Amino acid sequence: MNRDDAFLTVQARLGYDFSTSLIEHAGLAYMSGQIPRVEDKVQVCGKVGFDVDLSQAQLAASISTMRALAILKQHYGTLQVVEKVLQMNVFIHSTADFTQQSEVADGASEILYEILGSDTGQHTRTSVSVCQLPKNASVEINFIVALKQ
Amino acid sequence: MNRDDAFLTVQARLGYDFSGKYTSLIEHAGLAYMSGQIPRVEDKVQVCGKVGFDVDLSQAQLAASISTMRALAILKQHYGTLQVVEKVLQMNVFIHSTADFTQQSEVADGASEILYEILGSDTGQHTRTSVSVCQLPKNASVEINFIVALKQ
Amino acid sequence: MNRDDAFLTVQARLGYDFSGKYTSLIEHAGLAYMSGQIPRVEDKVQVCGKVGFDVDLSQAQLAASISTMRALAILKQHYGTLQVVEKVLQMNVFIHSTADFTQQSEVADGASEILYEILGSDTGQHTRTSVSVCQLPKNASVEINFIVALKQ
């Protein structure tokens, strides 16, 4: 399966309709932080490790990533424009005893590998816990993406 | 048109003078990377405390405005004029808040609005991220960093 | 004499051996993006805990130093030598701390000093952001990421 069809499959599996947010400069796309919202309605709200568990937090990370990918696909028409996801910053709304930030971020990284593949899905990342996020969201993720020239 | 006079006007409206182990700004390949700015002006961090506890939404928006004006003053000092700005590529807003504060977007609007008023809706467009942190240098309420594309 | 010798000297001074699903470093257009580094060396996240509670300022500075040395070791492994570094464009420092900790700048100085000691006051110049977070992977006390310009 190619990148755009794989995207469609992940979108159907999650059960959401995903189809300034992004600025392009010098072959790079800078993307605003994305919370797990669709239309407006924030989809996974709460504090990870208290009222949100690890599985749900990974889901939230997946949704934020799919939103970013949808924004790219809408702006450029196809995910074939992605050369590399250079950087992914994951901010997790959690308790002060939660230590599984890597596993939560794996929920986003897996989406990248599933849609972009072994090589193009490679990315650097940072994962930290914050004490709150916009509209009580549980995860927020931003990206810098290299675009194919 | 006249971004520098607009900057001076915001400085007058806010009532602070901005024309007063790391580096504030580094340029590479036509981009200026800027260090995180807390609201320090005329010495003294201006709006200290925890948003949603001893700092309210309006004061937090002011704090965001001050951090942004600080960044613009640094740009004006390095490049002589805000006409050097092609685009604010990225603005990261870190808000020192309580665990029930969910209006991070409204706090960040205090910075974004300054960018739009001074630079215009075109050169003022920017991506942004706004998250709550549990503390900041010198008990500051907001800290903001930037990546700015430069003209020519 | 050069930066690699300085790295070995600082490594001896610190007393850890650094030569021993994401990617640590990706290069694009002459920039190396680096993942956030917690103070992991000799298969132990070193230090760990909440700064201002069970980690004091000195230990947090050591943690910041270890994360920085890790980043430098990754660059040296990828490129064979630290002579490829032109500038550390950006260093973001996230500190696991209490809600009363306000010395984030002093913690980040532990990283900045490593950069200056190994790379020099010129190549070691960097912009920086330092904020407190409420937790980190594996209960770590500091996590640091980097954007580094390469000489070309």
UniProtKB/TrEMBL annotation, chain A:
InterPro entries: Endoribo_LPSP/chorism_mut-like, RutC-like_sf, YjgF/YER057c/UK114. It holds the Pfam family Ribonuc_L-PSP. CDD domains: YjgF_YER057c_UK114_like_1. Signal peptide: none annotated. SUPFAM superfamilies: YjgF-like (SSF55298). This is Uncharacterized protein.
